[PDB]
Design an enzyme around this catalytic site. Structure first.
Site, short mmCIF file in Angstrom:
data_model
loop_
_atom_site.label_atom_id
_atom_site.label_comp_id
_atom_site.label_asym_id
_atom_site.label_seq_id
_atom_site.Cartn_x
_atom_site.Cartn_y
_atom_site.Cartn_z
CB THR A 197 -1.32 0.10 1.25
OG1 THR A 197 -1.72 1.28 1.14
CG2 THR A 197 -0.39 0.37 2.60
NE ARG A 198 -0.47 4.99 -4.86
CZ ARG A 198 -1.64 4.43 -5.58
NH1 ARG A 198 -1.52 3.44 -5.96
NH2 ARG A 198 -2.55 5.96 -6.01
CG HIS A 202 -10.23 4.00 4.13
ND1 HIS A 202 -10.01 5.62 5.05
CD2 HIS A 202 -9.60 4.26 2.67
CE1 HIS A 202 -9.21 5.98 3.40
NE2 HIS A 202 -9.25 5.94 2.85
CG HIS A 205 -7.89 -0.58 2.64
ND1 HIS A 205 -8.00 -1.03 1.44
CD2 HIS A 205 -7.86 0.90 2.40
CE1 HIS A 205 -7.47 -0.69 0.64
NE2 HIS A 205 -8.49 0.76 1.62
NE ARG A 291 -11.87 -3.04 -10.79
CZ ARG A 291 -11.91 -2.52 -11.22
NH1 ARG A 291 -11.17 -1.62 -10.95
NH2 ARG A 291 -12.53 -2.73 -12.09
CG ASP A 292 -4.96 -0.28 -11.96
OD1 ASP A 292 -4.67 -0.54 -12.56
OD2 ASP A 292 -5.17 0.99 -11.53
CG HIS A 293 -0.55 -4.63 -6.90
ND1 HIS A 293 -0.74 -5.24 -5.66
CD2 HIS A 293 0.59 -3.81 -7.03
CE1 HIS A 293 0.44 -5.19 -4.88
NE2 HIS A 293 1.62 -4.50 -5.66
#
Ligand code: NA
Lengths: 512, 512
Positions: A197-198, A202, A205, A291-293
């Protein structure tokens, strides 16, 4: 269950070159050695190498590995590796080195990081790199950097470690692969699933993560990137505060927080595989691929840089070879009548209520200052975000008097200043004269960052628009390019002031 | 500045017997080897010995070191050591062992802890130990244990590490001396002031500790005891929650929490020196010794076991030799008009308003459910203590129908039950018949602990009073020893029920 490093051995160069430290230190601090100061992305990169994070790497890639990585996603010996890790340099420095030359790599022009033994110096075809590695889209963050920030010459070489790049924040929170592996053993943590994570985390997550832990029978490693993320994101300091807070929302003894000095490329697809490799070296048996990592997003024409599932499929296609397990994160939605998040897959929106907050809406609720549902993100976390990203009432701004204006610039400034002071609330105001001085123009965004309102008498030269920053900077002029447009250039000051006041009020800066 | 272990070298036996683990494990679980089940206190001690925390010890003390420790607070070879760490065994087991005999020490009768090579076997004079080591007063927690719990035969001998005792709670929180020192090295921590405690920490503790760090230019180490503290206290779980919560009220990167598996002897004077040694082995250059440090308090006649400053004075007198600095905690008070704690020394009690909350007044407010000022203890901390130590309305209890009662026991219990159920308030009520069975008497306190109200139809034999527990247990009888005294033995049931109701209401259990 704890994975062996990528390539079988942890390239902990700090530990392998321990005894030769003072020896290397001196050589590095000798006037006879050529010096190269590491750029920010290079500092992050070199830390992961000396660290063992980039195992099996031992230095910056030579043309042989670099080419194999670019065209085959593998090192010359076949080891999976999708992101070129090269030491980009400029022509000048390039002309002072040849094979076997010993270079000293410093941080901030004074801290000895490591000694590099050259073995290759080449001028890579950035066209091919951009295309084959980052999908060639000119707007892709990595490609932009590749052409405007990355030197044009790569220097392949082996490294000998002196010390990891210096950090003064979050000490002992930046655990190296060796330390993390040791920490996992202290806790008797066999299976470990890592979370990339960048961004702030929330409730979703926290739930998706605990779920991964439950289904994989592993412990959770929240491994946030604090080196370099996507340009223009939330500072890592703020994110770490959010992480340290959300970590408390997990059952006791289930999660562990550790920061990764990684410098992302936002290269989704490949980056994901790169991420799986990195966590593997850090001790993770499982890796969550979102998703869209690592995806930048959409370009100018609204086209996506990567497909939403490209990353999950790529990693999945290499997992057996990588010897790690992939935990895919499916899109989720909130079910009010049950107070739980559930995979969009199994929800018939025709017979069930669903709530979702897009990143745009969140950014809006922080700009406007509206409430944020406790089901979306925890109270403590929202408070943290509210402090770093204050609503318009607490935001700074700047009003620049256009060149087309003919009114008394001094009087209009005095008038605006006097007027803004009537509203009060906390914002500090100042008539700011830069005199087209870079030393002063560089401070504009600093004052805005402080919530201050600046009244600027004159515009600066166009060959400096890059020194400022467009954020919350408004132009008052007659030209159609102005933010606050006057019908004439010789309007009454009271006329002009009212136009500015109502503009700011409409944009939420003033509240009555 | 980070001190060297006490004795020169850290005796991390687990680390010196690594290449012999499988071997030792075998011998332990072998059929020939004699086995001994480690007592709870012996577990805390052995863990510190194998740990290195008890450096330079390498096993339990034999008669040579023991007597040396008892009379001159030193080990045979001179080395400073005030508390006698010995393996207390019963007579029977002592007769199956002789010098050179090897013993397998187990945890819970099934976990191989370590192999002991007997060197000595003796029957110490507990009357002398109780005198020279703990000052003699029979009501002293250590002297009581010494005679009523400790075996009468001490077994001296060396130890070989198999594994440290098992813990499923707070993994990785119980760092070893080797680990802590590493954790300190990782954070560039040189000077470290360690704080000892077996109780909750309040704002005062946070302030005094932060002040200590500031004065000694050191980082803070909150080193709570989680093994065995003072008889009947707040379980370490509740305290750990408190610590993890207050640890967050410190400037970032200033403090670090780590649990100490110590089994205190509550030997004030000597124990403080012992604590300094232990903390020294853990890497702490500074140790805080407070007022009546490790003190049991007062005996029957209301006489203190130790002098308020005996502990500070003793450690202070050996500090040079110990090679560690002593940080004295002076008695403090709260200044309302200045919102800060200050030493009682420089406070003109006449011209200055001061606030203080005694340990007794705190105990009272938790029993009553009264307010606890924010200046005294952080909200999050109070929350935790409130939940662990519920106020009377949420407390459980038992009403034991005395022997003198001639009234129907079946009908009185039924009337109490139906009457109690009228009040509600979340409490669960039950008529409990034990039939003088231990398996049932042992559950009475568990029920009271669950907030339940038990109605016990008959008293239990005198030979079983020790199986129950006095807390919130009231006797309804005619005798002068009854908690709820009845005029006659055959009072109308309604009359009895009311006396009991109003008694419980006057004692907080019922609120209307
Ligand atoms: Na850079």
């Amino acid at each position: 269950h704890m994975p062996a490093p990528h390539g079988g051995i942890l390239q902990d160069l700090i530990a392998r070159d321990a005894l030769k430290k003072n020896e290397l230190l001196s050589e590095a601090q000798s006037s006879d050695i050529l010096v190269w100061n590491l750029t920010p992305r290079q500092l992050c990169d070199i830390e992961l190498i000396l660290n063992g994070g980039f195992s099996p790497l031992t230095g910056f890639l030579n043309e042989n590995d670099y080419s194999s990585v670019v065209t085959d996603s593998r090192l010359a010996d076949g080891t999976l590796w999708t992101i070129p890790i090269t030491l980009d340099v400029d022509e000048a420095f390039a002309n002072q080195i040849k094979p076997d030359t010993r270079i000293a790599l410093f941080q901030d022009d004074e801290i000895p990081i490591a000694i590099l033994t050259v073995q290759d110096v080449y001028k890579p075809n950035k066209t091919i790199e951009a295309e084959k590695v980052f999908r060639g889209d000119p707007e892709h963050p990595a490609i932009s950097y590749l052409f405007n920030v990355a030197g044009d010459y790569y220097v392949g070489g082996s490294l000998e470690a002196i010390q990891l790049p210096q950090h003064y924040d979050y000490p002992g929170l930046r655990k190296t692969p060796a330390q993390l592996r040791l920490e996992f053993q202290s806790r008797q943590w066999d299976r470990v699933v890592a979370f990339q994570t960048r961004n702030p985390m929330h409730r979703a997550h926290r739930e998706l993560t605990v779920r991964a832990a439950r289904e994989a029978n592993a412990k959770v490693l929240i491994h946030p990137v604090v080196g370099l993320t996507k340009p223009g994101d939330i500072d890592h300091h703020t994110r770490v505060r959010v992480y340290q807070e959300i970590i408390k929302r997990y059952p006791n003894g289930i999660a562990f927080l550790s920061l990764l000095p990684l410098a992302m490329r936002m290269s989704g697809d490949r980056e994901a595989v790169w991420h799986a490799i990195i966590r593997k070296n850090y001790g993770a048996s499982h890796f969550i691929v979102g998703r869209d990592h690592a995806g930048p997003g959409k370009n100018s024409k609204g086209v996506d840089f990567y497909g939403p599932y490209d990353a999950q499929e790529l990693v999945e296609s290499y997992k057996h070879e990588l010897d790690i397990e992939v935990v895919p994160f499916r899109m989720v939605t909130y079910l009010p009548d049950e107070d739980r998040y559930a995979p969009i897959d199994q929800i018939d929106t025709t017979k069930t209520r669903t709530l979702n907050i897009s990143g745009t809406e969140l950014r809006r609720r922080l700009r406007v200052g509206g409430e944020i549902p406790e089901w979306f993100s925890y109270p403590e976390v929202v408070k943290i975000l509210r402090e770093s990203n204050p609503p318009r009432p607490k935001q700074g701004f700047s009003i620049v008097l256009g060149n087309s204006l003919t009114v008394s610039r001094e009087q209009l400034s005095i008038a605006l200043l006097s007027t803004f002071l009537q509203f009060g609330g906390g914002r500090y105001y100042k008539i700011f004269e830069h005199n087209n001085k870079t030393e002063l123009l560089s401070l504009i965004q600093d004052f805005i960052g402080s919530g201050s309102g600046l009244i600027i008498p004159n515009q600066w030269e166009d060959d400096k628009d890059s020194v400022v920053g467009k954020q919350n900077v408004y132009l008052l002029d007659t030209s159609s390019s102005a933010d606050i447009q006057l019908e004439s250039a010789d309007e009454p000051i009271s006329h002009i002031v009212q136009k500015v006041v109502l503009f700011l009020e409409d944009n939420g800066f003033f509240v009555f």
